[model samples]
Target: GERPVIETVQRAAAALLGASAAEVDPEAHFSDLGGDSLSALTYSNFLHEIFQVEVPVSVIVSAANNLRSVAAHIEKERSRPTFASVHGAGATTIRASDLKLEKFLDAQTLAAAPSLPRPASEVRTVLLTGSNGWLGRFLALAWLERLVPQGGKVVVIVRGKDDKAAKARLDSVFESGDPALLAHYEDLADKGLEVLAGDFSDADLGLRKADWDRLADEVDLIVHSGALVNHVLPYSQLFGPNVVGTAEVAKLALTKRLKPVTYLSTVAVAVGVEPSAFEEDGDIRDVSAVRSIANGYGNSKWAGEVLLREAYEHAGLPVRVFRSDMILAHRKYTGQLNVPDQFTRLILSLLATGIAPKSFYQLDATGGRQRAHYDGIPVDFTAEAITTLGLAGSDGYHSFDVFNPHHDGVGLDEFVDWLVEAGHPISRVDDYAEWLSRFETSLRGLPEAQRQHSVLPLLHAFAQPAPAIDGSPFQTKNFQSSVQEAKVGAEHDIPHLDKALIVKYAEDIKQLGL
Candidate 1:
C-alpha cells in the first residue's frame, strides 16, 4: 500500500511538471522538480481529492519534502482517526486531548528554561513585531505614546531586505496624507523607533546574533503580533511562522531576563468551544482543541498560545494573550482601515456592486429582519486597551477575549442603511438568492483592482442566509472590566457600534477610491 502511494504520487508529479515518470525522482524535492507555488497548490488539491487527506501546499513545496515524503504524509493522514470519524456524524466538538500541543514545544527548550522570578521594574525598552500591519501601526503608536514620554524606545522587527527598506515599509503606514497622523508618527519615530529587517519564520527571528542577544538582555516588554494571516492555507503552511516563530519569541523572553510577552491571538481559537462554556479568562487547554475544519490561521494562533502557556509554566514567564476579533478601522484617523479584512472587503464589495439583500442574515419566521449585532472594536480603542492591559500584567499567565459584547442591534443591515443615508446609491433586493446572484455578477464585472478587493471569491459564505445572532459567544466581562479600570475607551466604556462609525467606512472607501 505504501509503495503504491509513492508510485501514484510520482506519476502525479511527473504529470504536473510535464515530465516523464522515469525522470521524476522520488528523493528529489518538489521545487527541484520544477514545481512552484501555483503547481504546489494544484498538486495539493489533487492529492486531497484523491487520497481523502489534507495535504497543504506548504508541505508539497517545502525544501525538505519530496514525492516519497508527501506520499508518506498522505498515508499517515489516512491511518489516523479524525475527530468526526471517532465521534460519528455531526461531531463538531474538539477536545483538549485532541490538541497534543506539547509536541510542538521542543523538550530541550522547556528543560533548559530557568524558573525565574518576575521582573519588578517598569517597562522602558519594548520589542514589537508586525509594525507594518494595520493593527500593528496603531499598536506601535500606542507604545510610543506610553514609552517615549519616559525617554524609552520601541524596537520593531519587519521583513525587508535591509534596515532602510524596513523603515520605508513602516513609513508607508503614515503616508496616507493625514497630516495629524503623519506628524504624530514622524514625531514618535524621531524620538523612539528602531526598525530592523527580519523574518518570523527564521529560526533566530532572522536577527543577527548580536542583535538577538542584545534584545534578550535589554528588552523589557515583548509584543509579538506578527503572523502570516492567510485563510486558504492549511495549518502546516502557517506552522513555521505562527507556531515556531512564537517559540522563538518565548526563547528570547526566557533567555536572559524574564520579559512579559503580549501575544495577539484571535477569537477564531474558540471555533469548537461550546458557547455556554466559553469564558473570558478560561484555560485554553480546557476549552477546545484545534479543529480539523478550522482555518490554518486560527490553528496556528492556538499553537502559539499553547507554546506561551508552556513557557509560563516552565519558566514563570508573564504572558498576556489577547484573543482579538475584528480590530476595525481607526475611529479618528482618516483613511485608516484594515483594508484586507472581511468587513472592509464586504463594505467595498457592497458599494462597488451597488446591490444588497434586504438583510444580510436570515429573517424571522414572519419574514422580517431580526435584531443582530456585529462584534468589533475600533483600532484606537483596541490598541489602548491592549497596551494598558499588557503594561499592567507582570506576574502570571492571563488570557483576554478582546471582543465587543454589545447587543445594540447594529449589524450588516444597519451598515447598509447608514451607507444609503450617507448618499451611496445601493439598491436592496427583497430576495436573497437574487441579491447574491447579482452581487457576484456585479463583482465579477468590476475592474481588476476593485474586483481583487471585492468579496467575489468569498461569495459562497453568502450563498445561505447568515445566522441572526445578537452577540458573540465569547465572554468579554473580564476584558470590559479591565478596560473600564484602565479608562481605555471613551467615557471609560467600550464604544458601541453606531451609525457614525459605520458611515465612516463609506467615507474611507470613497477617499481611497475603492
Candidate 2:
C-alpha cells in the first residue's frame, strides 16, 4: 500500500505539536492531537510548502478531520490540475469536487440536533446576520414588518467594537435620508430591532456566553445572509467567513430549539452545470462537483449549501435555501440601489462617460441589434419573496433558484436605450471596438466620484462582443411557483425587469451626483 503521504503528514503533525512521530495517531482528530487554529494554520502552511497543494486551515482543523483525512485531502488536491494563475495569497488548489458536506459538518452535532422544527406561528424572535449589507438592509426591514406586528423582534449580529458601534453601523444604512425608507426603518427600529456586535467566523459568533445562551433559548428562526463576498479571492481565503460562518449559524439553528434556517446562497454555485441539466429543486450534492468554477466565492457558497443540506438530512432541521442572482435596485425607494454592484456600476459608467457600443452584445447577421433579456430581480421583490417563502416553510428542506427566467427582451442594451430616451446625454458608436476604446478613455476622465463608481476596473467584461441571449441558464420554477403561491410581488408573481426600473437607476445615480 502507498503510505508515504500519510506517514509524512503524521510526522508533520507530530512536529507541529512537538511530539514524536510514533506517538501521533493517524486516525486522531487534529484538535485531539492538541492542534488549535493557530497551529493548524502553521501545519497547513508547512504541508503546502512540501506538497505544493493547499489544505485549508478549516479542513485541517475540522472536528470531523483527522491526520489521515488531511493526508487524503492533500493527495486528492495534488491529483487535480490547477489553473495557471489564482488570485489571493496562499490560495488552495482544491476543486469543487474535493469538498464534501460531511467534512464541513461533524456527525455528533447532527446526531444531537432536534428532529423537528417549531411551528411557523411560534417563530417570534428572528436572528438576522449581515444587516449592513445591501440585500440585508431590506431583509431586516421585511422581517421587522412581519415580526413587529406580532410583538416579535429581529436580532441582528454585526461586526463592530461594541453593541453601540454595531447599532450605529446598522443605523448608517438608513441614513441615506430617503424620507419613506428612513421613517419606516425608524418605526421598525423602535418596535422590533435588536443589534448585537458579533463575528460570524468565531465559534460563539463573538457573543458573550450569556447572550449566546439567551439566543439559543429564545430565538425561533434564523436568517443567515452574512459572508465575505470577494470574487477574486481564492476559496481558502473565503473558507473561514463564508464556510465556517455558515457552520456557526447551523450550530445555532440546531441548538436549544430546532429553529428553521433560511440560508442566502448564490446562483454562482451553478457555474459549471449545464443549463438544461440544472433543476430548480435538485439535490445540490449531485451537481456541485464540477471543476471549472472560476472563483472561490462560488465554491465557498457551494460548501455552505452542502453543509446545510447535511444538517437537514441528519436532523430534520427545516431549511430553506435561496440561491439568489443579481438583486437590483428597489422600485419604491428614492435612493435604494446597490451602488457597488455591477449593474449599478455599468449604468453610472455609461451615463457619466456618455459613450457606449451600438449594442452591448453582438449584432445580428444583417447587422441589426437583437432582442435580449436581463436576469435580475429588484431588491424589494427579492426581499419579500425570500422572507415570505422562508417564513412559510416549517418542515422539510426546500431549495430555490431565485432568478428571473422571463425572456421579455429587456436587457442591458434596452437599459441604455431607456437612458437615451430619458434625456441622458449618452452617445452610441457604430463600431464596438471603437466604442470600447472611447468609453474607457472617457471613464478615466470622469470626476473622482464618478470614476470610482464606474466599471473601469471591470472593463474587461466589455472588451469583447457578447452573444445575445434571451434568458438565463438557471431554472426558477420552484422560486416562481412559490412566489405565486405566497403572492409575494407586485404582480403576485416573479416581476420582470422593466424600463421604469432601468430609468430609476439613472435617477438615483444622478441624485447621488456620481
Candidate 3:
C-alpha cells in the first residue's frame, strides 16, 4: 500500500490513539505488527483511559479496525470536542462535575461544543501584582509567554522593594518564564518585559502617578496572583497581602479602563472536612464557609477569596476566581521552585537527618489512608494556566480550575512505600496507619527549640493538609488541550514536553552532592 499523507487528520488520530503515527498505519498486518488478541484488549483499555467517561474496549478496536476510518472518526470526534479553556489553579481537581462544569462536562460528549462560546474582547496589556512571590512569579512568566505570541503586554506591580529591587526579583523569573526554564527568554526582547516598582499596601498600587496613569489607561487585563500563603499568619500580616493587596488590585481594576480581573482563589473557601467531597463548584463564599481553619493560613486564604468577590461585584469590574489544590509540578520548567515544598521536602529532610526513615514511616506508622490533592502539578502548569486565563475573559471566568491529574487523591502512602522500597527509607510496618499517629505525635512533641532543622518543618507539613487556595482569580486553562497547546507558547514547544519533566529533579539533584 502507498503511504497515506493525512497531515491534518494525522495529529487527531495520534491524539486519539496515544500512539506514534508510524505505528498505527504500518504496512504490516496486525499479526506481522506483533499483534495478538491480548493486544486488542490492551489497545481498547488504552482508549478507556483517555476520557472521564468509560469508553469500552470493543469500541476502541472497532474504531481501530481500519486506520483511515479511525482517522475520520477521530476528526469528527475532535470537531465535537469541548473547547478546553484557560480557567484556574492547582493540584486538587477539575473535571467530571466541578461546579456547573460537572453538568456541562456530563451534558453530552460533543453536543455542547460551541464554535464561538467566548465573547470577542480586546486586551492590550495586563498588570500582575505580587510579581515576586511564588504565585505571582509563576503568573508573570506565563503572561510574558502569552505576550510574545498573542502580542499582548504585561506590566508587573512589585512589592517589598523599590524599583531596582523589584526588577531584580523578576530577573530569575525572566530568565525562566513560561512552560519551561530550560527554554527561558527565547521568546521576548530583554525589555519586552517591564516591572512597575511599587508596594501593594500603598495607594495606586504603590506606584507614582505617572506609573499609575500608565497602567490605568493602557492595561486591559489584570491578574492578581500575589497573596499571603502562610498558614499561621497573624491577621495584621495576612490582611495586607491576602486582604489589602487584593483590595488594591480591585481598586486598580475599577479605576482603570475596567479590564477583566482574575483572582487566584483557593479551595480554602469550602467547608470540606475529611470524608467531604470538595466539589469543583461548591459553595465557597466566605470564611464561615470552610468547615474548619486548620490553622491561620487557611483562614487568610479563605478571607482573600471573599475579599475579591466583594471587590469584583461591588466595583462592577470583571473578576474571576480560581480555587487551586496542592499546586505542584516540575520545578525546572518554570524556575518556580518550592524548596522541595511539602511532601518532597519531608522526604528529603528525613534523608538529610542521616536517618533512612522509611519514606512513609510516619503515615505507615499512623495507620490511615494517606490524603493528597490533584496528584500535584509542576511549575510549568502553573505558568501556563495563569497567563491563558488572564488573556481570556468571560469565556474563562468564575471558574475553579483544579490541577489534579486524577479526580481522586493519589495513593500517597503507596507512593511513599515505592520510595522506601527504592532505598529512600521506612519502617517495617505492612500497614501505614498503625504506627503513623504515634510517630507524628513523637515528632510533634519535640520542642520547637530542639527541632530547628528543615526536616522538622517537612514532617510537620505532612499531618497538615496542604495550603488550599482561593486561586479562582488566577484563571487557568480548563482543559488539558488548551494547556497542552500553551506549551508551544511556553514550555511544550513539542508534544510530550511535560512528560520529560517528572524525572528531571532526580538527575539535577546530583548537583546538590548529597
- Give the number of the best model, judged by TM-score: 1
Whole-structure CA lDDT of model 1? 0.80
TM-score, candidate number 2: 0.81
Which is the winner by TM-score between candidate 1 and candidate 3?
1
Indicate whether candidate 2 or candidate 3 has the larger lDDT. 2
TM-score of each: 0.81, 0.81, 0.58
lDDT tens digits by residue: candidate 2, 332-430: 988789888888999888877788888988898899999888889899999998999998878888899888888788888888888899899888899
Give per-residue CA lDDT, model 3, range 481-508, as digits (tens).
4556555345442112222343343333
Question: Could you tell me how far off, in angstroms, the CA of residue 337 lies in candidate 2 after the best superposition?
Answer: 0.9
Q: What is the overall TM-score of model 3 with all chains considered together?
A: 0.58
Task: Rank candidates by TM-score, best first.
Answer: 1, 2, 3
Off by over 4 Å in 3: 1-120, 173-183, 186-191, 271-279, 286-294, 331-336, 353-374, 395-397, 401-409, 417-453, 458-502, 508-514
Candidate 1's TM-score: 0.81
Stretches > 4 Å off in candidate 2: 1-108, 114-121, 290-294
lDDT digits (tens) for residues 274-353 of candidate 1: 66787667677766653664476777788678778767766788989998868888878889998878899999998888
